[PDB]
Write a protein that binds this ligand. Structure first.
Ligand SMILES: [Zn+2]
Ligand SMILES: [Zn+2]
Ligand SMILES: [Zn+2]
Lengths: 144, 161, 77, 81, 250, 441, 62, 206
RNA sequence: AUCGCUUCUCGGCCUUUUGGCUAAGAUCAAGUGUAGUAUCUGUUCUUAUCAGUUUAAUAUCUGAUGUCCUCUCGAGGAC
């Protein structure tokens, strides 16, 4: 029965995810986690998308509690919003120059993969084939 | 393309500046890159309308627009620079006046036509604040006695009231 | 870092995960194998392919499980 | 620290200090599914103990409904040994 | 070292931009990445969402918000309407004035039910006037100053403002249609600008806006610019399916 | 929008089947699986008409289906491996006409994953243990004992986690009250992904292997690997214990092989083809499905082949060994998702695309002017045979099915007022355009 | 060459011109030009483009 | 009548415009997901229903205010208003009414011999009713085969605005004890429930 | 007007600063375990290339200070 007050509460969480403090963003993230697990399956996915926009920047963080509540928010948000949306958030930073960003994105993508590794089969991008390998999946584009 | 926002109003925000840029034509750049100390508007700005004639007519239009209530001019980026112009053509419009008298300079006051108030039809005189006194000189010279619309022009430096 | 003992135990636990140095080859080959295991599991994409080519379900799954061995070219170097 | 040597069919139990919380999520609410542990952290003096306190097995460790929505309950004996 | 050679593999940014099929993406540090052909194909995929700005910065991502002063959170309308805020302000001022002794006296002899606020006021706010806030669609991460960017870049000509009308000499409101701005005047006079030749001016190259007036005084449409043979300057300066949803409730 | 979802006609196509006395009697019941559906039919011996008794929803994917009988009980439980991380045990109540869940064991995560068990599942022929298995890295085994009141129990599971290994099949080998044990295929993609040349892609060999129980010591020990010549799809179990020898028929491409560990010298046989056919010089031949009639007298296998031809197989055996193989052409029926060879003289040919059939057996597939084939008959060349219309089987029943429904069109294209449906369905030569209508003929 | 982003961080001018060269080629490619694409059959059962159609049309045959 | 919904093989539906007088084919609005479509259908001028190779049906709607005529990889996009995991490859949708005077419907015909319909709701009373019916049914009468129903119907992308008529229609074959328990949560009589169950197929299908 | 005064009026906003007396009327103010974060506070740092290590790029790190004499990093020159 959060499908009712999700709208009332969003502009307060976006308010507190635009900084106020570490603990401010740690706590707004916990709230996002539990909203997502409650509203699983009732269509209030536009609101959780909106709040993804604000939670995802905290991904580069260091404090244990803060980054941990962030990761929790992203597992909740993974079941509630689906694994396409989150694989798309996780696409570009898998192969980044840096190593702090490579490592956080591979941490996330690992947890997105463990749970729901089987949806992703229809969510992976199209990755062209160079000379001595084959990389396209022709299985999937047989016409019929 | 590049237009000098002169008499650039302080609080007249670059947002509505660009909205007027669009309401005139190609709003591509509205910028008043100000003092590195103040933040407020620095009296001259760059407004880019990516079409030259667009910026030209937008300038002819947004001159005398009351920026901060005050006429501010879009141009190429009070010591008596007012000229009296008589034998005046009553058959003109105000933007036509600004474009006819703005060829030798900016117009810091559109031509105020000294018309009678009983009717609304003029007796043939006006005065116009141009940019420079040499500007009023050159314009009043090229139009001294020269071809006005119906009653030939007669222009020179203006009197003070 | 005992977290890491557990975490490369996790890499040892879930075939298909990654780490910050993982190569385009390991990544795309793991996704390719997973694609095959699910074409087999889901009883209906099997009909899709069986019917797309003119093969039959034994033919289909035999191809698939043969391909499962070097699906995306030979290795990296 | 975790046991995580894979699951089984032996239920876990809670001391009375530890009474009520989930095993990981540390909740206090809406428990849905029962906990199971491994034989190795099942045997002997470890029969019927508190997965958390180590105290005597009296109340049943359970799984917060969030933990079951995210299936963090499909890994096995999570005993902090 | 071993890297000293992969670093010679570390191609040119022009190497990249010419190789790649979509060159918009290619950025500075792209090249020191172990697999730039991938990285660029990814960054050029649809719908994907780029890394935040601030991984480079040595200036902290939020600690940069440190400096300023900030105004308290602003409630939703449908919650102000129900008039809670004034109740709470009043109770606040009361209990900031009251003194410790009186505080404990009220602890021991409470002012039970000082106030009231009726239900159906609440239940109607939350269940009858609750409304969609403004949300941002997939991708638009918030970064320090993301909110500062303000809706502008209104390139579809007709875009006018009310302060624009006032400080340009034109009208604001329902007359923003029937008011041709002072730039449509020289649009009719010598043409609309030659980089917005795909723009038509209303009353100058477009027809009369709703109930416009033809005439040559202040407040009209004047001569819709036309040739000597009668064809307008462009377009028509004078003026000469079934979107029903299938499953919808009664 | 707000929608409500209704299914008018259930899925008809058949994927899996088992046969057993699922109501305790010696009237046999058949339990087939549609897509997300478990449907149970009982074939009447009188007319030969099969009544679809119980059709149930399971809201999942049936990846694996296998019946089993406890050692001496009169019932026929079901073990279902589906796409949740669970193994489930099912029974029939004719009193309520309903499937009943005896036990339930979680072992992992949901969805049709790759390393979580459930794709393959086998039992031990006597009914002592089950093994659940994935297509990589995981297999478990469950032990089954009647309780004091004989209500079944199931203890914790065993383990066989072996990395970097496929599985093309798993099956229980028929031992006589020894430790039960299982024959899987295998492979090892490991090296072929360490070799930058693609050599190890080629030159890798299936390894027909046996794991073994040890119920005393309660673990699974790797007994018997053997590198097989060439990959073959699956393994038909040889009725061992008292009847028959033990051992597996490896159904590999073009070649069906007996094999068992110990002293036996391994037995071959090439597959006899039809003669003068019109098939591509390249196209191999594989054994698709099988079904074994093991009766008081003897046993035999049927296996089918791509062009639909059925074959009979029995074992020519001396004392403890078998000696040689005889595959003799039985007949050719639709391509089969499964055969379920009844007693009472029928067999269920579960079509794979279209209407599925019930044949009745007329002659044992023996002693007529159809030739004889053998694993002892040497040759330089192959065998052949020339097929013919139905000799040994007689088409009793024909159940309809839309599988597959390749296209549709709603319209009112007869003069009737209500609309008909025009369903373009079926595969290849067996395809059709079929008219549906709401009326009954 | 315009100050569009595509060249930002390309600082050498020969690189810039070859970059913008292929960019030019691609923009002209993905433009749909009716002159060469939009094509017209004459009455005589043989086909030309829009351009040539109007060309020989208004120089007195079509 | 003048819009196109092209549907590529992997990305999505892609709304395309034909401006005749300039004679252009120009994009204005597409989707935000990958969807390997097998066949789509039109429900209105702005709404398109899609099948998918993996099981799903979805309904995607253009936002109400589309700047139809103008001149990552798009300008403005469409939204998703329903998401259902049918369970088998759905190879043809069609907007249709079956029995005479029956309200409209969506027929879907899968690849395994399955045929069905998705049928709108007219009243939050109906809607909330079955909503609660099944919200209890999941809890007290889970599927046989180990699965969870919510997760099976949200296999790929979560459920949104579809109720599982085939779980609801199981109340009949349930047991008197549970039939009671749940219909008493609804505080209607098992007669009330079962008749409200049957009649909703009655007014749409057979 | 101035300049000296007288008085009063006004303006600042300044300045003033309280209820007397008694036995200064009397009396008196009782928090951890763990880590750890952040904030204050205190403090400490001219090198001229180039080679590499490194890094998204810097940086770091490592190594001698255009070569040669020579006098005191500095200088005149064969170059
Ligand atoms: Zn927990
Ligand atoms: Zn353990
Ligand atoms: Zn405890």
């Amino acid at each position: 029965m959060g499908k009712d007050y999700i709208y009332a509460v969003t502009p307060l969480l976006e308010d507190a995810l635009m900084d106020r403090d570490l603990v401010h963003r740690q706590t707004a993230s916990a709230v996002v986690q539990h909203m997502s697990l409650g509203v699983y399956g009732f269509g209030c996915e536009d609101s959780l998308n909106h709040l993804l926009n604000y939670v995802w920047p905290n991904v580069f963080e260091t404090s244990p509690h803060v980054i941990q509540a962030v990761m929790g928010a992203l597992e909740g948000l993974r079941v509630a919003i689906g694994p396409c949306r989150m694989l798309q958030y996780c696409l570009q930073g898998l192969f980044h120059p840096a190593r702090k960003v490579r490592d956080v994105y591979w941490k996330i993508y690992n947890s997105i993969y463990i749970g729901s590794q089987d949806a992703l089969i229809a969510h992976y991008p199209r990755i062209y084939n160079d000379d001595k390998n084959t990389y396209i999946r022709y299985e999937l584009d047989y016409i019929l | 393309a590049t237009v000098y926002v002169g008499g650039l109003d302080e609080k007249v925000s670059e947002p509505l500046l660009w909205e007027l840029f669009l309401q005139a034509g190609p709003v591509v750049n509205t910028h008043m890159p100000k003092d590195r100390v103040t933040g407020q508007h620095q009296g001259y700005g760059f407004v880019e309308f990516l079409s030259e004639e667009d910026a030209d007519y937008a300038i002819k239009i947004m001159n005398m627009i009351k920026l901060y209530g005050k006429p501010i001019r879009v141009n190429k980026a009070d010591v008596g620079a007012n000229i009296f112009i008589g034998n005046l053509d009553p058959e003109i419009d105000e933007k036509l006046l600004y474009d006819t008298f703005s060829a030798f300079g900016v117009i810091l006051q559109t031509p105020k036509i000294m018309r009678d108030p009983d009717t609304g039809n003029s007796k043939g005189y006006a005065f116009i604040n141009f940019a420079s006194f040499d500007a009023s000189d050159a314009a009043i010279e090229a139009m001294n006695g020269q071809y006005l619309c119906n009653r030939p022009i007669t222009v020179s430096y203006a009197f003070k009231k | 870092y005992t977290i890491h003992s557990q975490l490369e135990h996790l890499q040892s636990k879930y075939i298909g995960t990654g780490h910050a140095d993982t190569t385009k080859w390991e990544w795309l080959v793991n996704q390719h194998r997973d694609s095959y295991c699910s074409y087999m599991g889901h009883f209906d994409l099997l009909n899709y392919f069986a019917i797309a080519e003119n093969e039959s379900k034994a033919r289909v799954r035999f191809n698939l499980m043969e391909k499962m061995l070097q699906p995306c070219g030979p290795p990296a170097d | 620290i975790f046991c995580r040597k894979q699951a089984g069919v032996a239920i876990g139990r809670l001391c009375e200090k530890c009474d009520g919380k989930c095993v990981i999520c540390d909740s206090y609410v809406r428990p849905c599914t029962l906990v199971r542990i491994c034989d190795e952290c099942n045997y002997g003096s470890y029969q019927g103990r508190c997965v958390i306190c180590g105290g005597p097995g009296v109340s049943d460790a359970y799984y917060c409904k969030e933990c079951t929505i995210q299936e963090k309950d499909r890994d096995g004996c999570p005993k902090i040994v | 070292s071993k890297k000293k050679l992969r670093r010679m593999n570390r191609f040119t940014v022009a190497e990249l931009k010419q190789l790649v099929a979509r060159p918009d993406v290619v950025e500075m540090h792209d090249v020191t990445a172990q697999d730039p052909k991938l990285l660029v194909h990814l960054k050029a995929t649809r719908n994907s969402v780029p890394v935040p700005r601030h991984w480079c910065f040595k200036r902290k991502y939020l600690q940069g918000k440190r400096g300023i002063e900030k105004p308290p959170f602003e409630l939703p309308d449908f919650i102000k309407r129900t008039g809670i805020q004034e109740m709470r302000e009043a109770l606040q001022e009361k209990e900031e004035q009251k003194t410790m002794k009186s505080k404990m006296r009220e602890k021991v002899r409470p002012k039970m039910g000082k106030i009231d606020i009726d239900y159906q006021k609440l239940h109607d706010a939350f269940f009858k006037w609750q409304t969609k806030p403004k949300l941002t669609i997939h991708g638009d991460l918030y970064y320090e100053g993301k909110e500062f960017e303000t809706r502008l870049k209104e390139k579809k000509p007709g875009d006018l403002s009310d302060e624009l009308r006032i400080s340009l000499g034109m009208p604001v409101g329902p007359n923003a249609h029937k008011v041709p701005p002072p730039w449509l005047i020289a649009m009719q006079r010598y043409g609309p600008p030659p980089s917005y030749p795909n723009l038509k001016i209303p009353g100058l190259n477009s027809p009369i806006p709703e109930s416009c007036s033809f005439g040559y005084h202040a407040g009209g449409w004047g001569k819709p610019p036309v040739d000597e043979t009668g064809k307008p300057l462009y377009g028509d300066v004078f003026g000469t399916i079934d979107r029903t949803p299938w499953g919808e409730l009664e | 929008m707000f929608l409500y979802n209704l299914t008018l006609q259930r899925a008809t196509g058949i994927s899996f089947a088992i046969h057993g006395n699922f109501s305790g009697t010696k009237q046999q019941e058949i339990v087939v699986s549609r897509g997300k559906i478990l449907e149970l039919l009982r074939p009447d011996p009188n007319t030969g008409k099969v009544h679809t008794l119980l059709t149930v929803e399971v809201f999942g994917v049936i990846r694996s289906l296998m019946a089993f009988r406890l050692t001496g009980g009169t019932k026929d439980y079901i073990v279902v491996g589906s796409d949740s991380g669970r193994i489930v045990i099912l029974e029939y109540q004719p009193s309520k006409n309903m499937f009943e869940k005896i036990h339930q064991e979680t072992f992992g995560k949901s969805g049709c994953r790759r390393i979580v068990p459930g794709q393959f599942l086998a039992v031990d022929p006597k009914g002592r243990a089950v093994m659940i298995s994935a297509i990589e890295k995981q297999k478990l085994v469950y032990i089954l004992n009647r309780d004091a009141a004989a209500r079944l129990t199931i203890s914790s599971p065993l383990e066989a986690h072996k990395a970097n290994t496929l599985v093309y099949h798993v099956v229980g080998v028929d031992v006589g009250f020894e430790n039960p044990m299982f024959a899987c295929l295998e492979m090892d993609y490991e090296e072929a992904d360490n070799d930058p040349t693609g050599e190890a892609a080629a030159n890798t060999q299936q390894t027909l292997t046996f794991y073994e129980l040890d119920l005393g010591l309660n673990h699974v020990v790797r007994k018997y690997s053997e590198p097989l010549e060439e990959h073959g799809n699956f393994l038909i179990t040889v009725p061992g214990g008292s009847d028959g020898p033990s051992g597996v028929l490896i159904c590999s491409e073009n070649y069906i092989t007996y094999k068992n560990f110990g002293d036996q010298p391994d037995i071959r046989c090439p597959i006899p083809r039809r003669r003068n056919d019109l098939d591509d010089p390249e196209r191999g031949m594989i054994f698709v499905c099988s079904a074994t009639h093991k009766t008081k007298s003897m046993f035999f296998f049927l296996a089918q082949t791509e062009q639909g031809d059925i074959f009979k197989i029995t074992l020519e055996t001396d004392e403890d060994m078998v000696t040689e193989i005889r595959l003799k052409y039985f007949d050719t029926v639709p391509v089969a998702a499964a055969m379920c060879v009844l007693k009472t003289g029928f067999l269920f040919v579960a079509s794979e695309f279209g209407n599925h059939y019930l044949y009745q057996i007329a002659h044992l597939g023996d002693d007529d002017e159809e030739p004889e084939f053998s694993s002892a008959m040497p040759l330089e060349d192959t065998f052949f045979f020339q097929p013919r219309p139905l000799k040994n089987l007689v088409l009793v029943d024909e159940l309809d099915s839309l599988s597959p429904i390749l296209f549709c069109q709603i319209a009112d294209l007869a003069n009737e007022d209500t609309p008909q449906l025009y369903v373009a369905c079926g595969r290849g030569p067996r395809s059709s355009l079929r008219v549906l209508r709401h009326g009954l003929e | 060459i315009p100050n569009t982003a595509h060249f930002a961080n390309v600082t050498q001018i020969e690189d810039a011109v070859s970059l913008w060269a292929k960019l030019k080629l691609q923009k002209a490619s993905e433009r749909w030009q009716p002159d060469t694409e939009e094509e017209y059959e004459d009455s005589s059962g043989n086909v030309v483009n829009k351009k040539t159609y109007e060309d020989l049309k208004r120089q007195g045959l079509l | 009548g003048h819009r196109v919904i092209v549907s590529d093989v992997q990305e999505s539906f892609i709304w395309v415009r034909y401006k005749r007088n300039e004679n252009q084919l120009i994009i204005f609005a597409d989707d935000t997901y990958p969807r390997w479509v097998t066949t789509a259908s039109l429900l209105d001028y702005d709404t398109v229903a899609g099948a998918d190779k993996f099981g799903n049906i979805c309904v995607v709607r253009l936002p109400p205010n589309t700047n139809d005529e103008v001149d990552n990889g798009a300008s403005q996009k469409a939204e998703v208003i329903m998401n259902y995991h049918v369970g088998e490859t759905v190879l043809s949708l069609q907007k249709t009414t079956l029995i005479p005077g029956g309200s409209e419907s969506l027929v879907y015909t899968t690849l395994s011999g399955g045929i069905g319909i998705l049928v709108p709701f007219t009243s939050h009373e109906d809607h909330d009713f079955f909503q609660h019916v099944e919200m209890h049914l999941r809890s007290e009468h889970p599927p046989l085969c180990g699965r969870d129903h919510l997760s099976f119907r949200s296999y790929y992308f979560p459920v949104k605005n579809v109720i599982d008529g085939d779980l609801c229609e199981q109340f009949n074959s349930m047991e008197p004890n549970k039939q009671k328990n749940v219909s008493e949560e609804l505080d209607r009589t098992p007669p009330e429930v079962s008749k409200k169950l049957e009649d909703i197929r009655t007014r749409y299908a057979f």
